[PDB]
Amino acid sequence: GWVRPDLGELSKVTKVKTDRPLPENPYHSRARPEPNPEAEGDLKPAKHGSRLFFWTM
């Protein structure tokens, strides 16, 4: 009672039911380094302008 698969069937992506638990860290990754903190707050004009040698703005 064997029926030969038709053209295009053996190349389907199929689903598999398994009891094997999904591996958690298959890459064996280390802990990622912490990012830099972030930008926050309201923008206030620079104190005493640019402060280039003699410029007051």
């Binding site: 830099n36 930008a39 104190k47 005493h48 402060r51």
Partner: protein
Amino acid sequence: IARTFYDGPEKNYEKTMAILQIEAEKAELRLKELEVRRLMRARGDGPWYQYPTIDKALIDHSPKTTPDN
């Protein structure tokens, strides 16, 4: 002459106080900024001196024709 062309000493005195405060604040701010730049360039933890790395959004996380990547 003093009534027509000049003012009292208190005006110049307190204008000098204001000028001195502005200048001293600018001086300490300049020194602090130099120190902050030194630390940000040495450590790389600050917003400044950020050198580009590769965007992780370019990686393709799809099955790669062999099981071991």
